[PDB]
Structure 1
Amino acid sequence: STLLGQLCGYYTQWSGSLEVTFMFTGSFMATGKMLIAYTPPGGPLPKDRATAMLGTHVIWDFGLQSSVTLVIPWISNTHYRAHARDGVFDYYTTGLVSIWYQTNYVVPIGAPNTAYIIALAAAQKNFTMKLCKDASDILQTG
């Protein structure tokens, strides 16, 4: 969905630090804490909140700040793969981003008991891409 994603598609390789920003769009009266943790490539999704609490994490109190930005130190689509019979320069660096309810959602009478959040991503200035590769499902029809 991100523009970054769509552009990666016209290229074969790439690497750089990413950056996701979360936006709480709930009522102004709501408060609470969310734990956002990143498990580098290889590390399996943390069992629970506490184990994720030991990893690179960030406690987010949307009672204080409505936004928060997380940086993904590094991702590198460089490890080649020749599966079926079609060679694909794939990730493996599937870094993971988990998000747990550190505390529950707290609200006063009069405020909706649900709120949404929006993820926004982009890459740092250290991003790069290699190997033009035109590929698409959408093409000019006859």
Structure 2
Amino acid sequence: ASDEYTAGGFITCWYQTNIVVPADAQSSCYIMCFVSACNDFSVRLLKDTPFISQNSFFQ
């Protein structure tokens, strides 16, 4: 959860140089990002997801 004591940091990306595109080639591109846990990853206290919800028993 959001706690200012356990702050994480900031992740940013910047243009190092400039995109170099030849004539007759689109100059607007897209990047994609994937995230994965490392070998040292670990979690430690079962709880209930905030997202799941219900107003009354289904069917």
- TM over 0.5, shorter chain: yes
Distance in 2, Cα, partners of 1:112 & 1:141? 50
| Counterpart in the other structure of 1:126 | 40
More helix by proportion, 1 or 2?
1
Distance 2:55 2:45 in 1: 26
Instruction: Tell me the distance in 2 between the aligned counterparts of 1:121 and 1:130.
Output: 20
Q: Which has the larger radius of gyration?
A: 2
Q: Percent identity?
A: 37
Deviations 1:67-107 (A, max 9, x none): xxxxxxxxxxxxxxxxxxxxx57331x22222111111110
- Structure with the bigger percentage of strand: 1
Uncovered stretches (5+) of structure 1, i.e. residues with no partner? 1-87
Within 5 Å, give how 1:10-49 maps onto structure 2: none
2:27 maps to 113
Relative contact order higher in (CA < 8 Å, ≥ 6 apart) = 1
Q: Tell me the equivalent position of 2:16.
A: 102
SS at match of 2:12: strand
Give how far 1:133 is off: 1.2
Corresponding pairs, count: 54
- Shift of the 129–101 alpha-carbon distance from structure 1 to 2, 3 Å rule, reads same
